[PDB]
Paper text:
The mammalian global genome nucleotide excision repair (NER) factor, xeroderma pigmentosum C (XPC)–RAD23B complex (hereafter XPC), in particular, faces a difficult challenge. Once bound to a lesion, XPC recruits the multi-subunit transcription factor IIH (TFIIH) that verifies the lesion, which ultimately coordinates the assembly of NER factors, causing excision of a lesion-containing single-stranded DNA and repair synthesis that restores the duplex. The previous crystal structures of the yeast XPC orthologue, Rad4, bound to model lesions have shown that Rad4 and, by analogy, XPC recognize the damaged DNA site by inserting a β-hairpin into DNA duplex and flipping out damage-containing nucleotide pairs to form an ‘open’ conformation. In this conformation, Rad4 interacts exclusively with the two nucleotides on the undamaged strand without making specific contacts with the two damaged residues of the model UV lesion.
The 2AP fluorescence of the mismatch DNA in complex with either of the Rad4 mutants shows a temperature dependence very similar to that of free DNA. These results contrast with the behaviour of the wild-type Rad4–mismatch DNA complex, which showed an increase in fluorescence emission intensity with increasing temperature (left). Furthermore, no relaxation kinetics (other than the T-jump recovery kinetics) was observed with these β-hairpin mutants. The results indicate that the β-hairpin is indeed critical for forming and stabilizing the ‘open’ conformation, consistent with other studies (refs 8, 18).
Residue numbers in the entry:
A (entry chain A): 126 to 239, 243 to 504, 512 to 516, 525 to 596, 607 to 632
B (entry chain X): 256 to 308
Amino acid sequence: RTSRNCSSNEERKRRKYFHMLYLVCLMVHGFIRNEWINSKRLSRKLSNLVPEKVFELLHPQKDEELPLRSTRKLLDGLKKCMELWQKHWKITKKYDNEGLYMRTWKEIEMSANNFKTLKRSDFLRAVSKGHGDPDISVQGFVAMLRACNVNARLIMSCQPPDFTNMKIDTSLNGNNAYKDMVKYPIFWCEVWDKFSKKWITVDPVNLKTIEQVRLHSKLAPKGVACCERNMLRYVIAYDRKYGCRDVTRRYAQWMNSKVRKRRITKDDFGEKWFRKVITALHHRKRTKIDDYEDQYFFRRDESEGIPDSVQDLKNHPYYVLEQDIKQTQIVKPGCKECGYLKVHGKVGKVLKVYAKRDIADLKSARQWYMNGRILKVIKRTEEEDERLYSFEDTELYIPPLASASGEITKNTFGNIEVFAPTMIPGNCCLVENPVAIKAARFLGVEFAPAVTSPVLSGIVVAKWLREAIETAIDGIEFI
Amino acid sequence: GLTVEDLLSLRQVVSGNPEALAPLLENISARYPQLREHIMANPEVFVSMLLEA
DNA sequence: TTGACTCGACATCCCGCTACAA
DNA sequence: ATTGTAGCGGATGTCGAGTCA
């Protein structure tokens, strides 16, 4: 009955790790490639590809009465450049194998079993001759635009293996595999319009179009077959000056529902790790353009709204179904649903969507005490009914200060309960160490065992005594 | 702490042959277990390391 | 075409006392 | 004898598969 195609949590955690590892590698490859693009030797040769007429078209004069017409001229320039690049790029290869498209966990495992060293010269020579796969082709096109002094980002859709794929056997359909894989590009270009203050999307090699993305993009894969090998999750923009920015929100129609489920950024550790990576790769400092962009993203983030299906309201950042409200949460007084969802596949069946910012988290008395807070019905399991209280019913707990002799106030068991810094007396400190208790007892100074989690993890002693304890622990072998 | 032969193969794959990333990453991650918890704690270090080389 | 629903086996979060042995 | 030592998880969530409208 059950062929049970599911793996162990061990494999789960490994896949998550390898996903991070592959992503980081991808993003480094981008950074380096973006370097190779800035190559000064290349620009000077590439300049002669562009007639003065086209160059002038690329830098039109400000038109004060109607800025649009300047943008209009700019667009014509970009199209003529794309044309001569079609002309510059003679022989366009096939991706060897799957190129930089996403590989399957199975493909990886098996890739161990079964490469032209390239480096920087070979890239340059290729781009100058016009020989390479579509990735090189695009990269060259961005180089060219850059050699003309336009602010031209290289965009990369990173396709690491999917770490939410829990399956043991992960097998793909063979039909039209390559044509469906190449239906949308892995690399492309963005360009900053100073007149309209927006980034223009450009795909000169694969789809050969130019778009001003608002809510929909021709480049974002659609249907199911095209999305197996191209799964849009991390769209990274590198600019001339070694900026690095996550622009996913531009290209994802449902970023906060659909896409957020497939990025590492859905839990908090993830978000913080990703930001660490962006900062590692972001070597310039914030410009005003960054702000025009952030405002666009904010507005996009507020225009997504309730999704059109129930599955998209699981673990949504802003939105939650009435039915997914935990037993221990309540609705903040005088708030209500922010929206409705027509439920696909039952006539008239509708669900209540609340904004998550209108939901309050409740905790019992002990639970608060364990966060260092004290006070200014449900079913538990013997049978008991447990009352829960909100965060604003409560107040920090300030524990009594230690005496002159450094005496600490203890509990019935002769310890002091320290589950949170608040619960350390003001004049005291917590020292967590298997021997901290051995130490303090050996010195026979006044202390109190710290319960940090019947687990005695350490000591609470007066601050004047700190230097002494730190020394005694260090000498524990001699006690 | 990593060898210089692996950092060499890695600088070269990452820079000029990313098609071959997949199997190399299988290999190297299998030869340096601690790399896991490293990558989780301090990615920006590993970055800078790959940039110098 | 797609989403809703159910079901299978994992996780994840949150919540010392009796008896024997040398 | 007596002290040291050793033996006994529910509400909720996630994803895969299969099924239905």
